[PDB]
């Protein structure tokens, strides 16, 4: 089905993992001398800033695929102490971010490191052949 934009906002993370191509679709874009022109323009640039803020992180991380992705960073237990079948079938994305909001910035540091490290490491395999 197509529940639409943000359809699975109250659904389990496993059920909302099906609707990631819909929320990404409507995330960018669906006049004389006045005050509404700027009213729309500064919003129309904030849209772009809010999009590329995410995209540059998605790029400097290992995954420019822009949908879903796995990474070579061990899930540090200290972050949640919850179970695979107890979050993907018993918790909502908002609730989840509510738990992990504290450590989000930390994780971003580790992803940037792991990715730069992987790319530097792969150049050495490409250079010997």
């Amino acid at each position: 089905v197509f529940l639409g934009f943000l359809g699975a906002a109250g659904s389990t993370m496993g059920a909302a993992s099906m609707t990631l191509t819909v929320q990404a679709r409507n995330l960018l874009s669906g006049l004389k001398l006045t005050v509404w022109g700027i009213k729309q323009l500064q919003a129309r640039v904030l849209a772009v800033e809010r999009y590329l803020r995410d995209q540059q992180l998605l790029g400097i991380w290992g995954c420019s695929g822009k949908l879903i992705c796995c990474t070579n960073v061990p899930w540090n237990s200290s972050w949640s102490n919850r179970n695979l079948s107890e979050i993907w079938d018993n918790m909502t994305w908002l609730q989840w971010d509510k738990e992990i909001s504290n450590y989000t910035q930390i994780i971003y540091g580790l992803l940037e490191e792991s990715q730069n490290q992987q790319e530097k490491n792969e150049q050495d395999l490409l250079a010997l052949d």
């Binding site: 995330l27 904030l46 809010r50 908002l94």
Partner: protein, 453 residues
């Protein structure tokens, strides 16, 4: 069994935030303009088929009284009011000493001359010869100063500019929209007092047509409530906090200006030209507003039945009129056909309800020189040009702005009087069911998946 982080892009993750919203109005609003629309000049045409997604299992907490789309709307309306009168003709070479008299009428001594037939000089196209021309003004616009010699009421407060006659003051539906990365959540609960969790929430891109109607005591052409009439208040116990009432059934109101006015086209300068009020064609009659006493009967009964849910069940509820102050607060200040009415609401809020075919007409006064919203700086004052013909308008009464008295431990009853002054309430009566949220679609989750090397 060793877990791995996994990045997710497009997760239903939002957070409460505040952005610059823009307008949106139908294609017809852009159609009906001889430069007549006061806003639609650069508004985005609305989506032909708006879409409202119901978010199942979602429970979001709203707060109407600390919502920011209201502040944006009001300050934007203020700025639009401002900007629409900048290039319009300024009446600085007015305020001349006015030699005024009563209007031509023989009525009893219990009729104070509301209208004054005034004569004064004026500068013609050339900056030499003056101009002994006459006009007709309302008593509220003028004030004596020491043959009765007057002045305009605002000559001693601020400058003045006339509102161009080409522009109109017709409230049109405005849909407010948010930019990409944001969304507007709309509570879909029938009984919701604006504060707390909403069981049935949906989302949308642009709200429904919210007409910016400027009134003070009674909300007009608003959105009706569903089923039982709605009461909303930030703190019911605090007698200083207004109580916004939203109606379930509309109360029909009819306001009319029974004076076939005349427009005098004076030439004050080589470009500017002033629109005075010429002689009246017909009878000297007063503006008035009608309210069917039956519908008002049942409406007052239905609001008191909802009041008893908050102030104890076996108590007496009395209604009294305003206390006093400015005319803008003590009268139902509003605009209809262009003239700015100020009606006496003493015949609507003089009642008393115990635990258990005609129209109520209201004396409505008219004022042309109004200075709401401070005047865009400390200077500008607007003259509402005179309107030819009898103006008749039919509106809906869709809500009230009440205030309770501070009896403390006075009685089992407490009296309620109309209030207002702060017009942000006029918008909180329609932006009680909406809130803004930013989208942060980056979410990481664990799973036993690692990308290979």
């Amino acid at each position: 069994e060793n877990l791995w982080v996994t990045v997710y892009y497009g997760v239903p993750v939002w957070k409460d935030a505040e952005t610059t919203l823009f307008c949106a109005s139908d294609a017809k609003a852009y159609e009906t303009e001889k430069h007549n629309v006061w806003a639609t000049h650069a508004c985005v045409p609305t989506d032909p088929n708006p879409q409202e997604i119901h978010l199942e299992n979602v429970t979001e907490e709203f707060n109407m009284w600390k919502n920011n789309m209201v502040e944006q709307m009001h300050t934007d309306i203020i700025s639009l009011w401002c900007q629409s009168l900048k290039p319009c003709v300024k009446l600085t070479p007015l305020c001349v000493t006015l030699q005024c008299t009563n209007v031509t009428n023989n009525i009893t001594d219990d009729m104070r001359g509301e209208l004054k037939n005034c004569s004064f000089n004026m500068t013609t196209e050339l900056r030499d010869k003056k101009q002994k021309v006459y006009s007709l003004f309302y008593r509220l616009d003028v004030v004596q100063i020491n043959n009765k010699e007057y002045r305009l009421i605002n000559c001693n407060t601020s400058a003045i500019t006339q509102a161009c006659p080409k522009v109109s003051f017709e409230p049109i539906p405005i849909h407010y929209c948010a930019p990409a990365g944001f969304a507007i959540l709309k509570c879909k609960d029938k009984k919701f007092n604006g504060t707390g969790p909403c069981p049935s929430v949906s989302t949308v891109q642009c709200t429904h047509g919210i007409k910016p109607v400027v009134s003070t005591q009674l909300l007009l052409n608003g959105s009706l409530a569903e089923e039982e009439v709605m009461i909303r208040s930030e703190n019911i116990t605090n007698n200083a906090k207004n109580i916004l009432v939203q109606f379930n059934t509309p109360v029909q109101i009819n306001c009319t200006r029974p004076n076939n006015n005349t427009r005098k086209s004076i030439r004050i300068g080589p470009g500017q030209a002033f629109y005075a009020t010429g002689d009246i064609i017909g009878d000297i009659r007063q503006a008035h507003c009608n309210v069917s006493k039956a519908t008002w009967n049942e409406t007052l009964g239905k609001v008191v039945k909802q009041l008893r849910k908050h102030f104890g069940n076996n108590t007496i509820i009395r209604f009294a009129n305003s206390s006093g102050g400015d005319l803008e607060v003590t009268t139902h200040s509003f605009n209809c056909g262009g003239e700015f009415f100020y009606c006496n609401t003493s015949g609507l809020f003089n009642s008393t309800w115990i635990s258990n075919n005609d129209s109520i007409t209201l004396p409505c006064r008219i004022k042309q020189i109004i200075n709401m919203w401070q005047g865009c700086g400390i200077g500008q004052a607007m003259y509402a040009p005179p309107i030819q013909g009898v103006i008749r308008c039919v509106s809906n009464i869709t809500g009230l702005i009440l205030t309770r008295d501070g009896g403390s431990t006075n009685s089992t009853t407490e009296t309620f009087r109309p209030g207002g002054g702060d017009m942000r309430d006029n918008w909180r009566s329609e932006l009680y069911k909406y809130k803004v949220v930013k989208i942060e679609p980056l979410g990481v989750a664990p799973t036993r998946c690692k990308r290979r090397v």
